[PDB]
């Protein structure tokens, strides 16, 4: 497998309506229950509401007045609309497939069995901005016994998030992609680094692949050794 | 709403030791008609959604290792990891699926206690590409160390810096149970070009290590 995939806008402006979609594979939206959850550092996990296989909706009173959950059986999708958004609605949003228990002629849900990957939603009046990507270049000489560290500095983007891969996913061992920081300029920055054999620097290409979905920007940066 | 409270908020035990997480509700989660407790346990690793571990308080989901078990009834529940493995480090959450609105506990961070490991320290001058645009970011990397707590200071021509750096630290690694940390010093290009010696000093316990470079050398 069951796979859920959320789609969203990245950034929404204050007082607009947030619309999200959940695409479902390996299960039918005509069966059981489908919830929306959101997550922040400060509040943790908050259940927004669900829709049942009858079409009955059940919303958190913390949000009832602003939320609509619906299904599209033709597209096998679940949707969420949240009106009059504010900064308090910035969060990672997940859709879930919730299983049913039917003791005798009637059902309720009991578990959020499969969660989507999530979609990050920032409510801000600021302007979306893609990142500048700078190399963290390894010196052609090693001063660490034959290992080399290299990376990419992903600077000055807004909003979150950025994802980074190396060599289109073929390089995973030894990679560390750090959590972003909010800079005093109000833009985010992060780095992604990897340690590699210094003996590889002349012959192995290292490219960081940076995706900033909110600005519809990808950046691929080849990181070359310095002489 | 039903309030869910977890204890402890964080724990750390050695590899192979027992870890227990408690979750309390302020209303019984036992539904008399089915004689089940409507309590769920999830774990969440960084960049990933929560994943199901246990439901109806004590039923393990398929694919979950045997070392995870749930117990308890009414208002007091426990997740036990009988032998903590490196890949188990995560934030663990309980959830009541008993009475709307559905509500979650605040999470418990589970970490491995391992032996001290000194960081491999690397320092990166700003790229020429960046300098063209007026700002210099100097990056200090502490790779694969333990414990997490470290003091990282910057010196420029031996002047201790303050107010112009920011740090970021990874989660605990799922294989070697270490952490990595970056510290980024932000200077104007003009400031960068009028000083020579750039140094990152890392202190843990009884050891300080300083890694430096000379601009233009």
């Amino acid at each position: 497998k069951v796979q859920l995939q959320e789609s969203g806008p990245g950034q929404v402006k204050p007082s607009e309506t947030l619309s999200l979609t959940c695409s479902v594979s390996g299960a039918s939206v005509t069966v059981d229950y489908w919830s929306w959850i959101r997550q922040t550092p400060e509040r943790g996990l908050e259940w927004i509401g669900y829709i049942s296989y009858t079409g009955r909706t059940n919303y958190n009173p913390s949000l009832k007045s602003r939320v609509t959950i619906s299904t599209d059986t033709a597209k096998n999708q679940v949707s969420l609309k949240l009106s009059s958004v504010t900064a308090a609605d910035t969060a990672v949003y997940y859709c879930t497939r919730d299983r049913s228990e039917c003791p005798d002629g009637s059902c309720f849900a009991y578990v959020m069995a499969v969660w989507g990957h999530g979609t990050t939603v920032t409510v801000s009046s600021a302007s979306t901005k893609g990142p500048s990507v700078f190399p963290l270049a390894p010196s052609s000489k090693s001063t660490s016994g034959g290992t080399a560290a290299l990376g990419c500095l992903v600077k000055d983007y807004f909003p979150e998030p950025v994802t980074v891969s190396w060599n289109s996913g073929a390089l995973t061992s030894g990679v560390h992609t750090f959590p972003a920081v909010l800079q005093s300029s109000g833009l985010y920055s992060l780095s992604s680094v990897v340690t590699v054999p210094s003996s590889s620097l002349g012959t192995q290409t290292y490219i960081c692949n940076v995706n900033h979905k909110p600005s519809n920007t990808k950046v691929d940066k080849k990181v070359e050794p310095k002489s | 709403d039903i309030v869910m409270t977890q204890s402890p908020e964080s724990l750390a035990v050695s590899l192979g030791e027992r870890a227990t997480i408690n979750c309390k509700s302020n209303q019984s989660l036992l539904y008399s008609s089915t004689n089940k407790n409507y309590l769920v346990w999830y774990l969440q690793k960084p960049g990933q959604p929560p994943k199901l571990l246990i439901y109806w308080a004590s039923t393990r989901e398929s694919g979950v290792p045997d070392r995870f078990s749930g117990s308890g009834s009414g208002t007091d529940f426990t997740l036990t990891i009988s032998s903590l493995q490196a890949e188990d480090v995560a934030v663990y959450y309980c959830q009541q699926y008993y009475l709307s609105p559905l509500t979650f506990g605040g999470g418990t961070t589970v970490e491995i206690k391992r032996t001290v490991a000194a960081p491999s320290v690397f320092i990166f001058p700003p790229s020429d590409e960046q300098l063209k645009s007026g700002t210099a970011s100097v990056v200090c990397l502490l790779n694969n160390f333990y414990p997490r707590e470290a003091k990282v200071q910057w010196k420029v021509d031996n002047a201790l810096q303050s107010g112009n750096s920011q740090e970021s630290v990874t989660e605990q690694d799922s294989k070697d149970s270490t952490y990595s940390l970056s510290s980024t010093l932000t200077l104007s290009k003009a400031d960068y070009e009028k000083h020579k010696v750039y140094a990152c000093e890392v202190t843990q316990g009884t050891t300080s290590v300083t890694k430096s470079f000379n601009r233009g050398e």
Binding site: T30, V31, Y53 | T34, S100
Partner: peptide
């Protein structure tokens, strides 16, 4: 959520009412 006491009827999925 069994304690809500508003369980849905056991027509899961909805089928042709015929």
């Amino acid at each position: 959520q069994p304690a809500d006491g508003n369980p849905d009827p056991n027509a899961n999925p909805n089928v042709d009412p015929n």
